[PDB]
Design a binder for this molecule. Structure first.
Ligand SMILES: [Zn+2]
Ligand SMILES: [Zn+2]
Ligand SMILES: [Zn+2]
Ligand SMILES: [Zn+2]
Lengths: 65, 65
């Protein structure tokens, strides 16, 4: 048997974090109070702009519907 | 002297074409009457779903602003 996963590549979009949030790639704070980084519209990964260049494209999440 | 170019990776989104449109990668018609393919939100490239993985990610266009 298997889980069902949605599989593709990340779809990052600038996001306004309402509380202090860290980069899921490098571990440093997403600096500032607005537009601090990007959140993947599909899986929720949060990254610095500069870290968008560093993460693997692979984007998967379990469809728990 | 240098053109100003916007340089990134493609941002493909499923698109509902209103008139017969060809794949910018392979040259075959984007078949169907809805969701026939994907259009890059940045540069306008049109591709079949199956051709998305065949094209280079590089996405550039001249900024004529
Ligand atoms: Zn993702
Ligand atoms: Zn980072
Ligand atoms: Zn493009
Ligand atoms: Zn094609």
């Amino acid at each position: 048997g298997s889980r069902r996963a949605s599989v593709g590549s990340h779809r990052f979009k600038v996001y306004n974090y309402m509380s202090p949030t860290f980069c899921d790639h490098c571990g440093s704070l997403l600096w500032g109070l607005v537009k601090q980084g990007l959140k993947c519209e599909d899986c929720g990964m949060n990254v610095h702009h500069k870290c968008r260049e560093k993460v693997a494209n692979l984007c998967e999440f379990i469809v728990t519907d």
